[PDB]
Design a protein around this ligand. Structure first.
Ligand code: BPY
Ligand code: BPY
Ligand code: BPY
Ligand code: FES
Ligand code: FES
Ligand code: FES
Ligand code: FE2
Ligand code: FE2
Ligand code: FE2
Lengths: 388, 388, 388
């Protein structure tokens, strides 16, 4: 659908994933934090190539396609919300209900036969853990838990985070995050020295192929994901040699992190514990268009009361955000960016030469291929085909 | 020719118009004002995708294709007019006559067998009402009147105006201008308050389909156009309601404007009277390339002598230009711009959902389809095919 | 391979040359000066569309493809040379030898089965006359002399020069340089007045077609090129006339230059003597990508000892560089640039109308077509096709 059939033919193992340049339809995705959207102040964003509007009305979020049915302009060019329940296109005043997208009035012609007989696409929106999720899909949504990693929605789990737009395809981001050997790029992170981390350079794998991961399709809430098990039969590498000469060493700090690493559909990584033994990291790589994603980073820590919550928050702002989310993950950003050119023409998928630790990535590509809930296409983006 | 055959098949009603992305060949178009081009000071512009040079020689305008026959460079990169009758290419000094485009000399080789045996394309140029029109077409031109709205060329009609380059396809501009319901976007114009205009929000149409317009193919000078008659059987809308609640009102001033609205091939709108009961507006949307047009705005007022002419001019500069041509029509510019994305892939033509007041636009699309004098193509732009 | 088959069919005379948009593979090309690359300080450049790294190790130059075999990132994003013999990719620490490109270690997994079993492409590099040449080709290189003009590699010949990136295809540059009538564009050069040059406006050719050039395929070092002989039977033009009227004259200085003009594969011009009777100019137009070339300019003067060498150098810096390489050849840069649009869609090759002095260019197009050592293609650039 999105990629040259000749390339798709050559990746048998994982063709749906190679075709899913625009992401997977019929999943939940986080797009902003709750606190970024106030009552009666609509926001625009692009998700899976679709321009969307989000509004908060009597405290509740609603999401409309930001494209008028009439002449295809963005309503957001000049927002006119003239009743709490509605938005009016600035051009010829077609008026839509936030609740169901129905065209309920046309100010320029209240006799129009179109009234009541057209409807703008809406998507479900839910807030959880101070995060706004959109179900970019058709029909009744699944529970959010299906599309979130374990423990993210636990009652006591306190989530704080950061979001930004990054110029790479979302798959380059997923793969970088779940890539065991990419830990090499983090060897000089301020986080490593300043938080006294143990951090190898890499891994000498052991065991068989199947032992390198746990593929999860037996989670009772219907989550689908892969655990990275390279360290169970594998040996961490702390000394990097060239021709037998040690030229680089790993980090020999005390704090043990990243015991459990798992990637989940639609594209969220959970690293536990990280960046400190008492907290976890959940990060999403949300498709905006073929070239760009939201890097939606969260750190979670179980907190028992408002006191714990407020100090977590203060540590987050003074330490974990600059030192970890920025000081550790900034290198991930430019690593993703550096793979853009090779994958741009869809040929990186066939001309890459993988090595042993990439078994984790292969397992993900296969899981995503088999268990995604739909391939987003340009027809989804450009819409229904009329023959008037 | 310009658009995917599959799309053209789906717009039966008006396929030539959908194909005419680059505009209609074999019409007159205004491109600048007379006062902008002085004796012996050639100017460059692009019209229907073609790079042109215009010069004034003994008071008269001439137009040459700005592309040397030899290696295809623009002569205008470095203009060398070394005799009044000629221009010399800066590269190998092929020299062309302004009057007929004939290659009359080559300074670098006066023995060349090419001399007298090659000719650059020329186009007819006429000045009228202080406006420079180019006939972008082949063969002997029609009278200018054929391609101008009624009354524009009347003896007493004094024309003043403004020109600029706007980033939309020319058809988006035509349609916006001739769109009865688009009056909604003008509801907050400074012109409306400050010139005490009556201006509805829209129209409740009445009568039959055919009564909504007058299609003109019986004009004796051969003009072809459409009058917008929505107000003859229709009722203006001054109260905009949502769920029966009045949320916006029109403008209840005294001055009645825009009694007669007509669109004419090749793409010129006449609104009478406007922006004041004693004057009219004529505006062209001239194709530059597929993405851009000249928005060539003129206001006309019958003046009996130099006294009337000079005060018209002073009102124009102090009032009508800032208040009307800018303060009213600026909103039209960004409205055009907002339709670009939907129409960019040629699919807006099939995926738009039209309503009743768009009958005027449909009538234009059909008139333009039937009565245009040719479809400009990329072959016109890139030129004659040689097999040397 | 690179151009629409329908266009290639129409240039029978010279189709390989029209197809060679990215240049000719299996030739030597100069890319920088020796003094620009220091011991242990690798540099990045693009040549024939390929991203390359060059390093100096124990005084000797080596060239590796700047694209990791693993995930296709540029090694140069963050260079890690951790042993003199090697470079380590910043991402997962695949480590390559400069000498043969072999993957000799992987810091992230020293047990990997890939080690010793993969190799990055290398290219031969030679320095001569203070210029760095890369053999962008496969297999054992020819002698450099094959791909350089006569006398460039003479022992006593002292070469100084300048390099920059110019935004045109390399062929537009070659043709401009070897175009006899293009001398017109140089008629106002500061060099002409300030160095008292004789410089005609052009040439009235005489003799037959074959007499206009000498095609060289009998050089014993295997050079292939064309001498421009237009002045042997032709008469220089010093008076430019339009309708018989003299409107421009040539330059009637004393110093006679450019007696011998020759173009050589892969695309180097030699003008002798120039810009002074006692020196010569050699200039390369090196393909970077389809849109851009290095304009690699050198001036050569036989020098007998260090005294002559040092004064040559001082004249070069104070006079010949600003006055000739800049003051004369700057006009060549913008002339090349002005042909870009006509040749951009590959149609200039068929829609150009050539005249008599272009016989030199035709002879080159045919020589290049017949004697080039390979057509660079996008498959060369994007690489070997794997079916893992
Ligand atoms: O995307 C990510 C975010 C945060 C931590 C890691 C990590 C993985 C392995 C070892 C150390 C850190 C990661 O991959
Ligand atoms: O393009 C245009 C230029 C000037 C005036 C109008 C107009 C049309 C209807 C009602 C009021 C003004 C317009 O369409
Ligand atoms: O590329 C070039 C570089 C330097 C000199 C010339 C030249 C050619 C003919 C006559 C005069 C100068 C040239 O073509
Ligand atoms: S484009 Fe929105 S009402 Fe017309
Ligand atoms: S390109 Fe104009 S004379 Fe050669
Ligand atoms: S991309 Fe270079 S080692 Fe992985
Ligand atoms: Fe990372
Ligand atoms: Fe308007
Ligand atoms: Fe030159």
């Amino acid at each position: 659908a999105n990629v040259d059939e000749a390339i798709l033919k050559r990746v048998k193992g994982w063709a749906p994933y190679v075709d899913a340049k625009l992401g997977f339809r019929n999943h939940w995705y986080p797009v902003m934090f709750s606190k970024e959207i106030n009552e009666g102040e609509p926001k625009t964003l692009k998700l899976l190539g679709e321009n969307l509007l989000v509004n908060r009305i009597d405290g509740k979020l609603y999401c409309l396609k930001d494209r008028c049915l009439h002449r295809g302009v963005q309503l957001s060019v000049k927002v006119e919300c003239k009743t709490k329940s509605t938005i009016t296109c600035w051009y010829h005043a077609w008026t839509y209900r936030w609740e169901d997208g129905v065209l309920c009035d046309i100010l320029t012609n209240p006799t129009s036969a179109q009234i009541g007989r057209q409807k703008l696409k809406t998507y479900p929106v839910q807030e959880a853990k101070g995060c706004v999720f959109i179900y970019l899909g058709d029909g009744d949504p699944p529970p959010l838990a299906r599309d979130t990693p374990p423990n993210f929605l636990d009652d006591d789990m306190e989530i704080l985070g950061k979001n930004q737009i990054i110029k790479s395809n979302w798959r380059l981001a997923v793969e970088n995050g779940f890539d065991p050997s990419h830990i090499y790029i983090h060897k000089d992170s301020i986080l490593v020295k300043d938080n006294d981390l143990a951090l190898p350079l890499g891994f000498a794998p052991g065991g068989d192929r199947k032992q390198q991961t746990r593929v999860v399709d037996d989670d009772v809430v219907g989550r689908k994901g892969v655990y990275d098990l390279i360290g169970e039969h594998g040996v961490p590498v702390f000394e990097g040699t060239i021709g037998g000469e040690v030229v680089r060493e790993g980090a020999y700090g005390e704090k043990i992190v990243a015991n459990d690493i798992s990637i989940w559909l639609p594209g969220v990584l959970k690293v536990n514990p990280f960046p400190n033994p008492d907290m976890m990291q959940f990060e999403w790589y949300v498709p905006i268009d073929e070239n760009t994603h939201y890097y939606f980073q969260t750190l979670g820590k179980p907190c028992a009361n408002d006191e714990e919550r407020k100090k977590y928050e203060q540590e987050f702002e003074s330490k974990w955000k600059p030192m970890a989310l920025e000081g550790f993950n900034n290198d991930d950003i430019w690593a993703r960016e550096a793979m853009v050119d090779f994958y741009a023409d869809d040929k990186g998928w066939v001309n890459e030469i993988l090595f042993e630790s990439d078994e984790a990535i292969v397992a993900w590509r296969k899981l995503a291929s088999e268990h995604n809930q739909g391939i987003q296409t340009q027809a989804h983006v450009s819409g229904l085909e009329h023959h008037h």
